[PDB]
Amino acid sequence: TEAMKITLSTQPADARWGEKATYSINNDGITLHLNGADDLGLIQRAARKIDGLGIKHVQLSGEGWDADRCWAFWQGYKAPKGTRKVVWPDLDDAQRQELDNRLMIIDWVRDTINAPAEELGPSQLAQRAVDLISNVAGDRVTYRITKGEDLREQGYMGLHTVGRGSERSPVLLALDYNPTGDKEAPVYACLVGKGITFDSGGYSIKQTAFMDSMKSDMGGAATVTGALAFAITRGLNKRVKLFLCCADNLISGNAFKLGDIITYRNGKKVEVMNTDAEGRLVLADGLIDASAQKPEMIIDAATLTGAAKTALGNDYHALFSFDDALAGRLLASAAQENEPFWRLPLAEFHRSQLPSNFAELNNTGSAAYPAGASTAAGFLSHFVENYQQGWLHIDCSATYRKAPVEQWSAGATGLGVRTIANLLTA
Amino acid sequence: MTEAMKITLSTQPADARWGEKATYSINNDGITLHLNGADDLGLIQRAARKIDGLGIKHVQLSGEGWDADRCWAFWQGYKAPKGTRKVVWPDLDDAQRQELDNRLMIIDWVRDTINAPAEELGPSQLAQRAVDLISNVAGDRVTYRITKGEDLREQGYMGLHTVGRGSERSPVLLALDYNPTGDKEAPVYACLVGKGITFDSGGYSIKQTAFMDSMKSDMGGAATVTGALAFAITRGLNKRVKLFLCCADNLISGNAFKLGDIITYRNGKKVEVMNTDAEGRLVLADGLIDASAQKPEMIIDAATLTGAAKTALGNDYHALFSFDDALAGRLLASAAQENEPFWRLPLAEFHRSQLPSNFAELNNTGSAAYPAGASTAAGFLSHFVENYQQGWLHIDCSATYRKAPVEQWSAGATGLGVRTIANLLTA
Amino acid sequence: NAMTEAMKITLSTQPADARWGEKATYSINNDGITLHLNGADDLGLIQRAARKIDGLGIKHVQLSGEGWDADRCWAFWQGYKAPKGTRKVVWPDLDDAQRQELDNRLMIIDWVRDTINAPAEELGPSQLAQRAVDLISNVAGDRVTYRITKGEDLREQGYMGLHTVGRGSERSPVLLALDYNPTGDKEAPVYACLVGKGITFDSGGYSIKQTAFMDSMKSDMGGAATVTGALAFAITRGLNKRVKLFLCCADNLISGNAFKLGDIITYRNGKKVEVMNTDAEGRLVLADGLIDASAQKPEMIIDAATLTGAAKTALGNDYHALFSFDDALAGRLLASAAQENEPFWRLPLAEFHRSQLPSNFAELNNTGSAAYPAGASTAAGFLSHFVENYQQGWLHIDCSATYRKAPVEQWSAGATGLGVRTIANLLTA
Amino acid sequence: NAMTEAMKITLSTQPADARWGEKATYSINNDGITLHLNGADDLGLIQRAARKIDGLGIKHVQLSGEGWDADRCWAFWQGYKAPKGTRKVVWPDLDDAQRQELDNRLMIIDWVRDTINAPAEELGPSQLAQRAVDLISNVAGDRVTYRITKGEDLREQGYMGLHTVGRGSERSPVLLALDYNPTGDKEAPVYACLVGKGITFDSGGYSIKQTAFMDSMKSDMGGAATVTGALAFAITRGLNKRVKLFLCCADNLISGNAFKLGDIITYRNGKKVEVMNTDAEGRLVLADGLIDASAQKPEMIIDAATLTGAAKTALGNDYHALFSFDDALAGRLLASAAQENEPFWRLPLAEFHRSQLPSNFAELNNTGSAAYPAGASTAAGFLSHFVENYQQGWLHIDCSATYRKAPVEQWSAGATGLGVRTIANLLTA
């Protein structure tokens, strides 16, 4: 397990590799050939190949290494199985401090989402979320976990109806980060995350090829939890509340059925016409709680629809909002944090593109309204009192890679944590 | 309180702008229905549906020409599961209004109970709502017995128990007894048997979402025979009739019945389960055994049993099965008097052996060689009626539910069948 | 092959001994095989016994002893006959009438079975039309005339239904217009018009079928073969009235010329049909035969077609589906089915089935919806748009009892021939 | 069942009486129908009302009273018009400028709707190319010239993309190269090149579609009709610059000559493409048009195509997908879309998309992988390999809002005509 040196050079590789070669190898170690086009993308792609060569011990040596370039290499080098060692170079304290916070919190998002569903049930997601934030938030953090029958008694009909099929009761984490300590302090932001720890699809059962990665259906919850923790390391000094709607969507003699009508505390009635469209049902409860706090902005994140992945692939997160100003601020943050986001449509006509013959709303679209991600966003707007301003919905199409690509190993990428954190501390 | 939209009747056509073919037209006074005498009940129902699609939520049935049937025809079409509708009835006479109010109360109870989501209507809720509807019109002339959960297993109701033990909501057998004379030894005139699957996922033979999304209505047979008995009583039924509802959920759990399982009934029949989604005939079997023990004059079972009957008759007719030509003819004669659609489909001695199993006397499913799903299901049920050749009617309720709205029906339950069975019991 | 020897088959109202079973349909002793009638359904029992005797490898039988009449012999042969192996049957002593009746069924009803069982390669539209002429003109003689319209001529003369369906095949579509006219008088009133679907092979078109459903689609010309045999058998029964036959013959295949979804066919009666499923081609070719049948203004029109799977889902392979608006005429066909021991069952047809095929681009669609799933009723409702006087003197037969994809208790694999006798009885009644 | 007499449609800012409600978009008294405008979106409301008025079965309307204009009349008609039935609309007393704009829309946009709604049998490659010349020649007179290359000539001259997809059909593939040159000068610089996918019927080839997804594939030539209608409308709006039109027209059918999976197509620009899905044929034909477009060295290239279902999954039928590397040009089209009241949404197109179609046997694959499931973005990435300067002056429109398989609030079934005004507006500005 001896270290392999990785150097940076602006000169191309020798003709034995080609002029376009991104990396070359000799006794002095591996050399990454930067060309100024996209050095972070090139380094991350090179790291993916170095892992593929069976090299488990590297050292970033020579000049040119900064936090962003070190992070790029790690993002691509990290893989779910195996042990990897990276000897970092001489960085100033601010550069190393930024890298350490990224390593601690963003890899926590990668590892939590990658974790098996047996290891990470609703209850484990709640307490691991408290631990991550409590470790950086000092004494300025209070929380409450409501599970099982208590969700029924308190009217959380969305989260309870979806989770009750499981032997692992559904959980609501309500975490409060309040820096001033003043219990009257105004709530600046409300983060809401979909924490479905495993999605069988319900009685609308999935096919194996589409269920084999549904341990990552809690990726929205892990991304907003990381965003809060990472924001705190960035100097967040405003009150933020975190709502994680956690549950298993399983099949039992108790699971919810098609045609069942869910009555939310805001009066909205929803006919369930597909148990696999469960993500929007649990988020609706988090959003009602989020609107009640009357925050300056509400941000909900969720691995909600496959329609977002058909529109943007795994290369961008989908951004939905009625607020043009707030959408531009998040895209500006996305650009500073070098994370991919693309705005997909959300207009008033999407709020009526979920017809039902037995209730005000349907949890699915139809053949006539097949914009799955746009209609889902339209459904969530019925649960945000002032939906036309201060609300962002993120369909996390870039959260999980079912197979290794050029720059990513398999599993969670951790994308979206820096963008949301940057918007919170802006 | 707002302004109601007047609905009047005319035997003359609309003006040259609406055209001679127009079934309705709107002037200053309100909406005018243009009758032609071919099928006024059908035309008025189709017109009411279009008046609902216009967004008009408050109507007044105005002027001459209205009676119980024309008012009922309008309501049947106007009513829909969503929204709130006010209908101001015309100045009907006592008898006409009594008959209209009996249909509103009982037949709309059949539409709402079947339209109800499975979460709000389980096996125990169905049995209880059935007792409530009948005692509301019967009073002290009705008594009943519930038998649920482990009690069914102990007492040998293996059909109903095996299908419903998968649900956390225990299966329920309701045995209601309408006895006017009170005499406990009075002869039982009719035995009604109804399939009450409050939700059908198909069991381990799981359905796809597109065919499961309306399975809250798989207890439609139970609701129809219940409404039929209630309606019969409002029509002056004065004979002893027993009602049997086999109510359960067909769900998936670690306790749910599996393919290959052999169910032994109380009459000796052994049935191999080769499709858990063919559960409706498994639960009726227990209902038909109890119905036969009463040795009644007639037995009428109703069930949303197969998609085959819907391929044969669509949602336009109910499927009638029987070995008794005289009795079948009387139900068709009742359907004609009550303006309800019924069509007879084949049931012969050879259907009784078109469910071959390698491991038991009977199979619960058919094969490629015998694809008449509705006829093979009726043939299976004949094995649980002692005198199957006489006094037994089976109804595959293909006209009970409408997955989508059509010309004369909103989405959901129609309530068809209640008047026909009620008329047959009172004839 | 070694010389096969006859196995004597006798009849007995005495049950078999205990070694076999309480109620066994047949027993085998030294002198040969004994069938054990019980008086319940002797014809059904004999046909089922015959099927089993085939499964014993016995290729040569001799019906000996008293008790054998025309029906019991025919009943036996119906079950003994199979599309593989050669079978010799020594008939018993019958009177001239009984033997002539048996010989007519053997010649015509087996022709229906063999022609339907024939591979598509051997029986194209032209072969079906010619073999139908050969059969009828072999019993009618000089009393039969016919015309054959095929290929480009169908398009030129407005037969857009049959041409559009068939132009995908290298084998041109064919329309047979045969005329059985006894008194010779060309002005004689046409008593009946038989119309038949003769799809010699149904790939389903661009709406391509699954192999499990196409592997028997050589039999999609059963209706054509059933009405042809019905006329031939009716003539041997002494049919002395004028009857015209129309066979709409074509292959439904896939080519760079095959018809497409969204195409609108304009028929001669002015009705426009949108094709929203190329596999619902049966009703497209019948519509052209039904126009010609109506034009002749006969006393009754009978049409046969292996049209829908909906009829097989409703009646199985055990009954032919009967569709009509005429209660009196449907009653007579069921009355005929009883005298000929053939299974028919009436399925619904009402004025509302005529509007259960909506289209966004044309008056009629060739397929039903999710809201109107009675495939056999909507198909009959589609055909009613091509019979000028559809409420009187018209019967549609969805031939669900024509073909058996697999052997059963009383039938081998392949065509059954059922329907030939019932139509014949109604024509000669 | 004759044509009825005119029913009057008046506009009003006063709401409906309580019987209808106060949120009712329309009411009906003895005088006729009244539309209740509120000012939120009167064009949307009027169009949705027209759709409901057609649903009542009213075939003859007369827009009367004050308040009507070209946009409000056009809104009413956009919703009233349907492919089925006969409708008549008496227009109100507009001024010449308003009536000239309405007449230009009725002529050119309803042509785009009627041409796309037409059955594949009526509109093959040659018919599409010819109707396209007829429409533009009607408004352009002698300022229009054109060139048609078809059948074996496309193979000879190296249009391997368009020829390989269309050769499976009996109807030969056709490339229309139309030139609108107002100044006459033959050396005039080409301002714009329009390219249109003109697949007159998409069976999907050997990668055959199911009936449910093919029943509307007569509309797979929507791109061609849209850019064609756009050039015609642009001329009525005073277009005074040279614009070339390229329509890659073909049938994607099955035959013994149809193209096969694994087949490598060599384009005139040297690019090799491995076909791994014959249903991704739209991009193979556009590639040939885009090479001709680039060769003209134009200021801008606009291509339109009903290319992928991924755009319909991403935007529904409510917006057209816009792809481009040119932010400024993309910004100019959305500005035109706003002025013309038409829905467009931009989807991602970046350098990494040019390598998201991997093949093991050729530089490019014509299909995407599970790893790159953004079908519309990878399709745009593929087309970019056929535009010389793909980073400047090129727009790709995935026409996800061109066809409605079923009636909705504001549209009947069939083609909408959306995209004609936007492209026309961009060309004229």
Ligand SMILES: [Cl-]
């Ligand atoms: Cl190189």
Ligand SMILES: [Cl-]
């Ligand atoms: Cl690692």
Ligand SMILES: [Cl-]
């Ligand atoms: Cl969802």
Ligand SMILES: [Cl-]
């Ligand atoms: Cl990996």
Ligand SMILES: [Cl-]
């Ligand atoms: Cl009446």
Ligand SMILES: [Cl-]
């Ligand atoms: Cl069943």
Ligand SMILES: [Cl-]
């Ligand atoms: Cl409804």
Ligand SMILES: [Cl-]
């Ligand atoms: Cl043989």
Ligand SMILES: [Cl-]
């Ligand atoms: Cl057909």
Ligand SMILES: [Cl-]
């Ligand atoms: Cl065989």
Ligand SMILES: [Cl-]
């Ligand atoms: Cl209102």
Ligand SMILES: [Cl-]
């Ligand atoms: Cl029109």
Ligand SMILES: [Cl-]
């Ligand atoms: Cl394509």
Ligand SMILES: [Cl-]
């Ligand atoms: Cl339409």
Ligand SMILES: [Mn+2]
């Ligand atoms: Mn799901």
Ligand SMILES: [Mn+2]
């Ligand atoms: Mn079932």
